[PDB]
Design an enzyme around this catalytic site. Structure first.
Site: not given
Ligand code: AGS
Ligand code: 2W3
Ligand code: 2W3
Ligand code: AGS
Ligand code: AGS
Ligand code: AGS
Ligand code: AGS
Ligand code: AGS
Lengths: 159, 160, 160, 160, 160, 159
Positions: C19, C43, C92, C130
């Site tokens: 992020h 949630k 990603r 996350s």
């Molecule tokens: N490692 C990353 N690299 C680039 N963008 C990311 C990364 N992780 C999250 N994001 C992006 O940041 C934004 C917010 O993401 P969140 O909903 O906070 O986390 P998430 O990607 O759902 O993590 P999860 O549920 O563990 S797979 C979205 O546009 C994501 O794709």
């Protein structure tokens, strides 16, 4: 037991898809370790103990396979027992992407273990534990998807 | 050529214009269409069974050959109990495609006499699902474009 | 060229270097950046809203122009009210692509004056999420590579 | 219910059991099937148009209602002229999906009275393609599993 | 915030309304836009360089801040010779996404000071490419919806 | 040389992406065989002979690797020399799908060979011989993408 390969899963329950991958690994390593995932917590449908036993009985025609359970990390297990390789199967694009991210993290956590992937055989490429459970619940024929001792534990479970 | 029934299964929680499109494009190809809502599934969602059926019955009024049914067990057994040789499903995206490949491969083991036919979503409805239409209605935005007037009142009312 | 504000939405449960990478690639392109967190998502995550906001705050205080807010309505409405004309998200993988294609299709119908700009993730944060981070943390392994010092100390607190 | 005609387009260079599988799953659903081959593609395959037509002809003569034709204009126009209201294509993989999503989007704008119906390939023909078959044939290996006897004898002729 | 140039590179063989959409959605975000046609590439296609540029110049008349350029070598070197920090590209489908991930990862090794920004194609233009627009014009169908009037005359004329 | 694994490719030219996969296979088999594809016919940019030599020099720090060339079928090669495994790398979804169909056909052609897949390391996942050639043609820096002896043959080729 110079080479040991580990085949992880929840195996809830083991299927002929899993089995194929284990069968196609037995002759390439001294030992195979089918590792069952504990709690973790995730609901239904077979307890750890039953999942292990089902696996034990579907693989008893295969001398170099052993069946264990781990709590910690899969790489910590591999290191614990001297296993340099992790084996998993790919059915589909979704499997592939999920797997790339897990194998990335595993490489960071321990660089000395490799994950090696085999494609599902074409007969078994739509088979999940989930979809077998789904169809079993409606009393359908599952003998083509799971070993006989597993067929029974599903019928027993689903009436 | 004979009497032909095709089944269009789904949650329909609620039906949208994306669903309805696939149904209108199927009416002029079989003699009967059974929109089949495969509930008991609990695994339940946001409208109950009778309200889901109700919503469908309403939105398919303008098509004579469309019956709305329910069923509990296996789809292929539903098809077979009514003499349908055909299941019709829609495709929007790569996620749909893989999920459906798995379902259809299984359905083919279970009963090889039922064919599954796929139609591509129109461009205008490619992004629409029940889920997102409910996310949007939950925050009271305009859903007039996504669902027919009668489904629209039920969502307004559900998330009032 | 007006005062530009961009919004970077997400749940950030917790914020990770992936992020952050996106945020640090957005600071220089706009006058104000709003890292926006999801409220009354009815949630639950691992960290409360307020915790999640606090962790972003310390992970971004080194930058000139980034402010942490919460919202409980639609993203495009938050944008509407603060005068943000842009949303920034990170891509990603292929599953991200499809999920995101649907949301921005919906966001364009809701409010066609906001654009969503996407950037590809850096190679070294492609696999971070996350979730994968919380997983590694629970087994009490070295997460120094994946999140900021402040986030790392708060994950160690969580998981013994 | 009128006289239905469906068209099954492709280059068939050569026809394989995977094309055949689709054709045999289409015979009973329509009154007439037209296997349609591409003419003045100003793009050479391994077999001339006439060869390709001949091979389909012998590979389909066992069925009741299948006729082999060529066309050099648009698919939807061939359909227009023979009164075909349906096109039938087979989906093997994700790359097929996307390629096909674009063509049927175009085909719907060109002529919105033709529908394209897709079926999933059988598990045992998922991996077949004319190309992979010609590749195996060139190394003079057993292609009995992949094409009809008539096609197999004509591939052996080709590649010594 | 400073003076900002963004580059929108491509073949533009010919430009379509799909391309133009991405360009209109970028004009109100940087002070200059360089539509950059990366020819010499031979590896050539159906309109020459000057006619491709010509076609662009015409269709971007109604946007003051849009210059049309050519360049031979590397895009990142073009960006750098003119002081652009930003490359803008469109995304239609999963095939685009992977191809662009590879390109952007490379571009990032070559010059980390240039950011690549992605926009999602509008729903109406998701299926449109130069290729298919040329397939269709080749058979004389209606292309009025796919390209602007002036590009439309040049395609009619090219495939007369 | 009880176990032998084969790593096929056109290698036009070999890259650090290829190399990674070969390096991560050397310690899991008695022998590695990097097999170069002949004609076949396909234009540019290095002849067979040069591609082999480049490979030979990028792997000479690895005693169990040998370099060969084949005309026939990859499974016929494996059978010829006693190799039970074929190793390939996956960078992306497109690699995955292309690979599933080839490994399907290979299994039909000989059931006794397995293909095993490893994920590209994240550093090397955008690297192709094609994209390296593209950037080399414009005189850019390639030292991070290819071994030194390959860097030279590209500079030499592209001025
Ligand atoms: N490692 C990353 N690299 C680039 N963008 C990311 C990364 N992780 C999250 N994001 C992006 O940041 C934004 C917010 O993401 P969140 O909903 O906070 O986390 P998430 O990607 O759902 O993590 P999860 O549920 O563990 S797979 C979205 O546009 C994501 O794709
Ligand atoms: C490649 C197989 C695999 C599978 C999974 C994985 N782990 C779950 O906990 C669930 C789950 N129950 O949700 C699930 O679906 N997959 N988790 C992983 C690792 C990914 C990166 C972080 C560490 C992970 C890790 O090692 N986690 C503990 C673990 C898993 C499996 C076994 Cl056998 C053991 Cl012993 C430990 N790699
Ligand atoms: C898994 C690696 C691989 C790669 C390729 C493959 N073969 C090409 O001929 C090109 C090409 N030049 O277009 C290309 O891109 N990939 N072809 C195959 C086989 C797929 C199924 C049919 C038999 C194929 C087969 O074995 N074909 C001869 C061959 C290839 C590679 C080597 Cl080393 C040898 Cl010795 C023989 N599997
Ligand atoms: N039919 C199959 N063929 C080949 N590999 C498989 C098959 N089914 C599962 N696998 C793999 O075996 C490993 C263990 O899988 P599990 O985590 O036990 O669950 P699964 O049955 O694949 O999916 P669910 O959770 O039932 S939807 C994973 O790497 C799977 O990708
Ligand atoms: N927008 C759409 N366009 C075309 N077909 C659709 C569309 N939405 C749903 N369908 C299809 O209609 C059938 C019934 O779908 P459901 O099982 O109700 O799920 P859904 O609403 O598409 O997905 P979710 O879970 O809300 S994301 C399925 O074949 C769907 O793929
Ligand atoms: N094995 C198969 N199973 C199902 N459908 C197939 C199969 N092979 C081809 N088709 C479909 O039949 C139609 C005509 O295909 P063609 O263009 O003749 O061959 P192709 O699929 O391009 O083969 P290539 O170029 O060797 S990958 C398309 O709808 C194909 O997807
Ligand atoms: N319909 C579209 N909608 C949005 N963006 C597009 C569209 N078509 C092309 N673009 C983008 O504009 C830029 C220039 O594209 P080009 O390199 O000209 O290729 P193209 O016309 O998309 O593809 P082909 O080879 O005709 S299939 C790229 O980022 C494209 O992805
Ligand atoms: N960067 C990489 N990382 C891991 N594996 C790779 C990498 N590049 C290629 N491979 C694999 O190594 C094997 C040999 O690849 P080649 O057929 O030589 O061509 P390539 O360089 O992948 O693609 P082109 O043809 O240059 S676009 C294949 O199985 C590839 O998928």
């Amino acid at each position: 037991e110079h080479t040991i390969a580990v085949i992880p899963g929840s195996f809830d329950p083991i299927t002929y898809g899993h089995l194929d991958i284990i069968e196609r690994s037995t002759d390439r390593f001294d030992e195979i370790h089918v590792c069952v995932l504990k709690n973790s917590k995730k609901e239904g449908t077979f307890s750890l103990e039953e999942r292990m036993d089902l696996i034990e009985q579907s693989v008893k025609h295969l001398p170099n396979v052993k069946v264990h359970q781990f709590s910690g990390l899969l790489v910590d297990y591999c290191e614990q027992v001297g296993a340099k390789t992790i084996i998993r199967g790919l059915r589909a694009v979704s499997d592939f992407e999920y797997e790339l991210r897990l194998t990335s993290m595993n490489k960071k956590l321990n660089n000395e273990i490799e994950t090696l992937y085999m494609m599902s055989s074409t007969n078994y490429s739509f088979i999940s534990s989930s979809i077998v459970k789904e169809v079993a619940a409606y009393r359908a024929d599952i003998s083509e998807f799971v070993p006989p001792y597993v067929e029974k534990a599903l019928k027993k479970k689903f009436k």
